[PDB]
Amino acid sequence: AKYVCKICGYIYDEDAGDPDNGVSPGTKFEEIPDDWVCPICGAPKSEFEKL
Template sequence: MTDAPYKTWQCRTCGYLYDEAAGDPAEGLAPGTRWRDLPDDWVCPLCGTPKADFDMAEL
């Protein structure tokens, strides 16, 4: 069984994109880190918006 395709999530406040495939190494998130694996208290690194206020982006 293969994992589902990687997804991208967008901050509703500032537009920051979190790409699961790329991760965010500057924030300590390795490439391949799934959205579900980010802590519930994770916030946008640009504006501080909570994880709950991100939407999956269809790119």
């Protein structure tokens, strides 16, 4: 699934992950550490919406 950061428009794609910030491809959004934030704007996970 894909999730959009409502603040900046960055799309978190579970298939891509966010390797530069310690999230391997295939990591489900719920499995991402609670302290991870949008890599672009710094918004907390609370500001993401599932597409």
